[PDB]
Amino acid sequence: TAEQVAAERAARKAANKEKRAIILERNAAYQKEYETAERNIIQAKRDAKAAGSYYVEAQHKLVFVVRIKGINKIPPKPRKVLQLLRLTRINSGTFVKVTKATLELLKLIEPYVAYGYPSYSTIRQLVYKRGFGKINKQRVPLSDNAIIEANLGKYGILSIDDLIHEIITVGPHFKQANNFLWPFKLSNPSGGWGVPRKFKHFIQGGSFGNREEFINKLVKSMN
Amino acid sequence: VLKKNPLKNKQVLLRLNPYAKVFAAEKLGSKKAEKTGTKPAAVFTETLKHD
Amino acid sequence: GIDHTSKQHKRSGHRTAPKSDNVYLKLLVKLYTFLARRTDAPFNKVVLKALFLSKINRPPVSVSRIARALKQEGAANKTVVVVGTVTDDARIFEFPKTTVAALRFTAGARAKIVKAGGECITLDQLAVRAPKGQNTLILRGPRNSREAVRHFGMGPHKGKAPRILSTGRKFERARGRRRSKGFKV
Amino acid sequence: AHFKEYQVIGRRLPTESVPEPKLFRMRIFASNEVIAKSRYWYFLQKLHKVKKASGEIVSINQINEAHPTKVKNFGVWVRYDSRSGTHNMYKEIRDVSRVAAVETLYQDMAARHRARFRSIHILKVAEIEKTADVKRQYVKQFLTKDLKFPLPHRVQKSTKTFSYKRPSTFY
Amino acid sequence: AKSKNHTAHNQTRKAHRNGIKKPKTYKYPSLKGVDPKFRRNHKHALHGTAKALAAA
Amino acid sequence: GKSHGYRSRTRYMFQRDFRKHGAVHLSTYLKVYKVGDIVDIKANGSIQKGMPHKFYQGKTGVVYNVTKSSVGVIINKMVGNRYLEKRLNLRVEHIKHSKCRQEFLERVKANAAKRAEAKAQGVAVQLKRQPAQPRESRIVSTEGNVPQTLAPVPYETFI
RNA sequence: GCCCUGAAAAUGGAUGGCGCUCAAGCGUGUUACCUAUACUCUACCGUCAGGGUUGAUGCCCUGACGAGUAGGCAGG
RNA sequence: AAAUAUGUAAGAAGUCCUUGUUACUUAAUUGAACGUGGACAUUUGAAUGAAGAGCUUUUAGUGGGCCAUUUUUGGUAAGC
RNA sequence: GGAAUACUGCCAGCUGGGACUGAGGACUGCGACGUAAGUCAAGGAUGCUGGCAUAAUGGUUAUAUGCCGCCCGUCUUGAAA
RNA sequence: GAAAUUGUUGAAAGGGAAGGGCAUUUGAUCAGACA
Ligand SMILES: [Mg+2]
Ligand SMILES: [Mg+2]
Ligand SMILES: [Mg+2]
Ligand SMILES: [Mg+2]
Ligand SMILES: [Mg+2]
Ligand SMILES: [Mg+2]
Ligand SMILES: [Mg+2]
Ligand SMILES: [Mg+2]
Ligand SMILES: [Mg+2]
Ligand SMILES: [Mg+2]
Ligand SMILES: [Mg+2]
Ligand SMILES: [Mg+2]
Ligand SMILES: [Mg+2]
Ligand SMILES: [Mg+2]
Ligand SMILES: [Mg+2]
Ligand SMILES: [Mg+2]
Ligand SMILES: [Mg+2]
Ligand SMILES: [Mg+2]
Ligand SMILES: [Mg+2]
Ligand SMILES: [Mg+2]
Ligand SMILES: [Mg+2]
Ligand SMILES: [Mg+2]
Ligand SMILES: [Mg+2]
Ligand SMILES: [Mg+2]
Ligand SMILES: [Mg+2]
Ligand SMILES: [Mg+2]
Ligand SMILES: [Mg+2]
Ligand SMILES: [Mg+2]
Ligand SMILES: [Mg+2]
Ligand SMILES: [Mg+2]
Ligand SMILES: [Mg+2]
Ligand SMILES: [Mg+2]
Ligand SMILES: [Mg+2]
Ligand SMILES: [Mg+2]
Ligand SMILES: [Mg+2]
Ligand SMILES: [Mg+2]
Ligand SMILES: [Mg+2]
Ligand SMILES: [Mg+2]
Ligand SMILES: [Mg+2]
């Protein structure tokens, strides 16, 4: 009883030390994986140009959506789709895998939400500061990798950065890894929406619709 | 009992995600990419500056 | 403001404790709430909720019901658990021995297990013997044979029993009950 | 907004019947690349059988002015929609850069004819090579030799609410 | 005095309160309205395979 | 006064298609129907017996009975806040086999056989369709195709 | 296009008022700012829920939620 | 001959092999039903969500409505 | 021909000023910094110093100022009417 | 020996009602904490 605690203790202290350096190994491999991914696209664009061709980027697989409209006076079809994407509240936001199946859920929902393509720096800053998990209902703040590993470990993903990697890459467990994240409750943009009147397309005078790369500047003022 | 924001509070930034240490120490928030000389051919700029 | 997808502040439709004030019932609960919580023993859970049930939900199990259950293959030696009262049944003759765990036993039912060589056990006694509920058969009465259930779903062409204070011909037998006077139900 | 000039190139989606479909380009004036791509489609759908569903945008590249410090005379050809109908116009704008001129093109068409952005198609913008190919008197004014003019009645915006001397406009 | 005649207003909203249900699907459905011949026959066919399965 | 009849408002609905009139070809009489089949109800205005009421036109359901000239069909009709089960007696000219099931059955064969050629080689299955994925990176060339630049067009009257 | 004419009603009077003319007007563009019981974070009340643990209507941990006539229930 | 609306389907209550039952039906041991025994569960055969699903009893109040967008009928029109 | 700069974007880069908040109450957790012993900004504020020790804070109340507030009750699609 | 309602006395306020809410000033007043 007096000795066997140092048994169970020194045990976990080593299995912690082990899980730690695994994350330290993985996160290093993700850093290289991104750094080379972006770097290839840049040169591939250069190469096309030198060849007198045009490199067309692949369409984005990943889209972030925040609901910018109030909860009153919504048509019933969009009201469903809005719930089915878990944005029931103003400024709240989630991630969407981009397929034709959810592409039409962005068409129907368009006047009530602003969406675009989030950058790594966004997804990171989202998950660290506003990242919360779903554990038996209750909304759990993600402050310790064990919390992730507990729920998402069966998929891999023992680290908050494995979550962040799973998200930004889409890939195999995106459905589950994403649905684990509690919808991000964002504040209103600090510095404003930059347009007088929100509900009009981004093409038209801003706020609502697909602003593509510009979603990032937005979310980071809200977040 | 308190949410702490890893993007401040370095204790936490290290608590999640080591390699924060490595990142900072190796910089690579910076890190100049290598230097290549590819020039866009001809037709590209012919059409770029076209009417 | 939120657009809720479900009714807020909606309480679970299940009983959290029995509506009785019977202090011994409370004790039996206090036992099985401990039992259910600290053991795996799915048996304990079921009995826990069973103790909460309302009289209409605890229909008597007769002594013949227990007997025919023991005739299942390999069941002969299990000990029956009935959360509720057990009743005597004259209609059977040869009754086996075994053991029964119940809230209440009627006189006839007690004498009919005992005179068969069996034993009468309360649920706390059953608890000490089967803390995990080992080798138990759980029995429930036929709650849907109640009189009032005759009248539920009353309707045209529904075949149910009308609510009636008196019975016979000339009591709601005529117009609408027969092809010859108007229509038929 | 504050404008930029974009090159937008695109093409039909390729089919097994026809890989390598013909490419088309537009110079589009926009504030950002999202509007630009839309306005590519907007005219393309006027000129050709495509929806941005059946096409894709091959390349989008900004276009920076060739000589940003050289004052040039621009001809501008426009189709716009009045209240009672639709009209073609030629105006001249003397400015430093193609974007600079398209910016004040939209101000003019808004101010003089009350024509919002949605009404106006920019048909062509072309620097005027040779002086006295300039037709419009309100440019030709500034093309004269040794052009000097004063700026009379000068209003000095005041810092504090009260001033201690009767002000002067003199310059 | 004249008063409103008919309108469908709100009826969908009330509908979806508890509503739209489903058909309540079951295996071995109601045979109501099946051909009475082949019902008579299907009785003895089922009786036959049950007798045979007990004979083993 | 108001008129709601059994065939009320079926003028166009029960009209026969342009230039397909008169006798019903023999294929519709040679089809064979089994309990549990899925059928498409489209009434045939040249055959007045065994006729569906206009509501069920276009509706598809399962056949629960088979008789001499007809099939019974089961349709779920919503009335009020729930569906009610309806059983329809329809003559075989008003009925057709649903082609939707037919694609599904054919994919289960295809799925079973895919899983076999995979298990025989001991490799990954993935029999569930994925929706269209966004797209992949391309390099389009300029050889033979020089981008031909376009301009908006002046207003012109053509009248 | 803006401006003028076309343009006549009854107490005294309303771009909300004052007043405003390279506007404090009209068209359009760019920012900065003001502030809702709304969004974001914390504290507190309550409601529901999940979990732990031998004033048992108990003690504890955790999350979410809070409009309301007619009306139903509940604790007082 | 659209748009928006709308029916059905996307499996374990499935699929395949084998071969039992019957007074139905066939010229016919043919079919139609309902079965025994054997095989296939990784991705258990689109997406999204799901904070749970299903089920019963019983009873209040209401059964003057009115407004906005769009569709739209009568009327010159109406705060009809 | 070689630069620079704008623009846009990124940094697990460093730093100055202000505001509100300090829930919790032995210990347990995840960590960081150290060769080390230890240390820490790491599962919620502590240290140091001053004044007062009473109408001073505060409560009550009357008045004054700023902004705001139609008369309830009922029928009603609609009531300050 | 309550209320409506009234006399006197004492404090206060009042340029076409009065009365209400949030907040502080002022005046009046008053509880709470140490030997
Ligand atoms: Mg600000
Ligand atoms: Mg605004
Ligand atoms: Mg009347
Ligand atoms: Mg009525
Ligand atoms: Mg009529
Ligand atoms: Mg037709
Ligand atoms: Mg047709
Ligand atoms: Mg007839
Ligand atoms: Mg005036
Ligand atoms: Mg004003
Ligand atoms: Mg001006
Ligand atoms: Mg202006
Ligand atoms: Mg308030
Ligand atoms: Mg509880
Ligand atoms: Mg439980
Ligand atoms: Mg409990
Ligand atoms: Mg206890
Ligand atoms: Mg208790
Ligand atoms: Mg209580
Ligand atoms: Mg309790
Ligand atoms: Mg609320
Ligand atoms: Mg309430
Ligand atoms: Mg409510
Ligand atoms: Mg009623
Ligand atoms: Mg009435
Ligand atoms: Mg009105
Ligand atoms: Mg350079
Ligand atoms: Mg910069
Ligand atoms: Mg404290
Ligand atoms: Mg004070
Ligand atoms: Mg007022
Ligand atoms: Mg009244
Ligand atoms: Mg009345
Ligand atoms: Mg009133
Ligand atoms: Mg008095
Ligand atoms: Mg008097
Ligand atoms: Mg006083
Ligand atoms: Mg006063
Ligand atoms: Mg307040």
From Swiss-Prot, chain A:
GO terms for molecular function: RNA binding; structural constituent of ribosome. It is found in: Cytoplasm. Keywords: Cytoplasm, Ribonucleoprotein, Ribosomal protein. Pfam families: Ribosomal_L30, Ribosomal_L30_N. Its main location: cytoplasm. SUPFAM superfamilies: Ribosomal protein L30p/L7e (SSF55129). CDD domains: Ribosomal_L7_archeal_euk. GO terms for cellular component: cytoplasm; cytosol; cytosolic large ribosomal subunit. One of its GO terms (biological process) is ribosomal large subunit biogenesis. The keyword Nucleotide-binding does not apply. Present with 101000 molecules/cell in log phase SD medium. Component of the large ribosomal subunit (LSU). Mature yeast ribosomes consist of a small (40S) and a large (60S) subunit. The 40S small subunit contains 1 molecule of ribosomal RNA (18S rRNA) and 33 different proteins (encoded by 57 genes). The large 60S subunit contains 3 rRNA molecules (25S, 5.8S and 5S rRNA) and 46 different proteins (encoded by 81 genes). Component of the ribosome, a large ribonucleoprotein complex responsible for the synthesis of proteins in the cell. The small ribosomal subunit (SSU) binds messenger RNAs (mRNAs) and translates the encoded message by selecting cognate aminoacyl-transfer RNA (tRNA) molecules. The large subunit (LSU) contains the ribosomal catalytic site termed the peptidyl transferase center (PTC), which catalyzes the formation of peptide bonds, thereby polymerizing the amino acids delivered by tRNAs into a polypeptide chain. The gene is RPL7A.
From Swiss-Prot, chain B:
Changing K3A: Significantly diminished nuclear localization. It is found in: Cytoplasm; Nucleus. Transmembrane segments: none annotated. N-terminally acetylated by acetyltransferase NatA. Belongs to the universal ribosomal protein uL4 family. Component of the large ribosomal subunit (LSU). Mature yeast ribosomes consist of a small (40S) and a large (60S) subunit. The 40S small subunit contains 1 molecule of ribosomal RNA (18S rRNA) and 33 different proteins (encoded by 57 genes). The large 60S subunit contains 3 rRNA molecules (25S, 5.8S and 5S rRNA) and 46 different proteins (encoded by 81 genes). uL4 is associated with the polypeptide exit tunnel. uL4 interacts with its chaperone ACL4 and the nuclear import receptor KAP104. Component of the ribosome, a large ribonucleoprotein complex responsible for the synthesis of proteins in the cell. The small ribosomal subunit (SSU) binds messenger RNAs (mRNAs) and translates the encoded message by selecting cognate aminoacyl-transfer RNA (tRNA) molecules. The large subunit (LSU) contains the ribosomal catalytic site termed the peptidyl transferase center (PTC), which catalyzes the formation of peptide bonds, thereby polymerizing the amino acids delivered by tRNAs into a polypeptide chain. There are 2 genes for uL4 in yeast. This is Large ribosomal subunit protein uL4A.
Swiss-Prot record, chain C:
Gene3D superfamilies: 3.100.10.10. Signal peptide: none annotated. GO terms for molecular function: RNA binding; structural constituent of ribosome. GO terms for cellular component: cytosol; cytosolic large ribosomal subunit. There are 2 genes for eL18 in yeast. Belongs to the eukaryotic ribosomal protein eL18 family. Component of the ribosome, a large ribonucleoprotein complex responsible for the synthesis of proteins in the cell. The small ribosomal subunit (SSU) binds messenger RNAs (mRNAs) and translates the encoded message by selecting cognate aminoacyl-transfer RNA (tRNA) molecules. The large subunit (LSU) contains the ribosomal catalytic site termed the peptidyl transferase center (PTC), which catalyzes the formation of peptide bonds, thereby polymerizing the amino acids delivered by tRNAs into a polypeptide chain. This is Large ribosomal subunit protein eL18A. It comes from Saccharomyces cerevisiae (strain ATCC 204508 / S288c). The lineage of its organism: Eukaryota, Fungi, Dikarya, Ascomycota, Saccharomycotina.
Curated annotation (Swiss-Prot), chain D:
Pfam families: Ribosomal_L18A. GO terms for biological process: cytoplasmic translation. There is a cross-link at K124, K130, K148 (Glycyl lysine isopeptide (Lys-Gly) (interchain with G-Cter in ubiquitin)). It is found in: Cytoplasm. Its main location: cytoplasm. GO terms for cellular component: cytosol; cytosolic large ribosomal subunit. One of its GO terms (molecular function) is structural constituent of ribosome. It comes from the Eukaryota. Keywords: Cytoplasm, Isopeptide bond, Phosphoprotein, Ribonucleoprotein, Ribosomal protein, Ubl conjugation. The modification Phosphoserine is found at S31. Belongs to the eukaryotic ribosomal protein eL20 family. Present with 54300 molecules/cell in log phase SD medium. HAMAP family: Ribosomal_eL20. Component of the ribosome, a large ribonucleoprotein complex responsible for the synthesis of proteins in the cell. The small ribosomal subunit (SSU) binds messenger RNAs (mRNAs) and translates the encoded message by selecting cognate aminoacyl-transfer RNA (tRNA) molecules. The large subunit (LSU) contains the ribosomal catalytic site termed the peptidyl transferase center (PTC), which catalyzes the formation of peptide bonds, thereby polymerizing the amino acids delivered by tRNAs into a polypeptide chain. This is Large ribosomal subunit protein eL20A. It comes from Saccharomyces cerevisiae (strain ATCC 204508 / S288c).
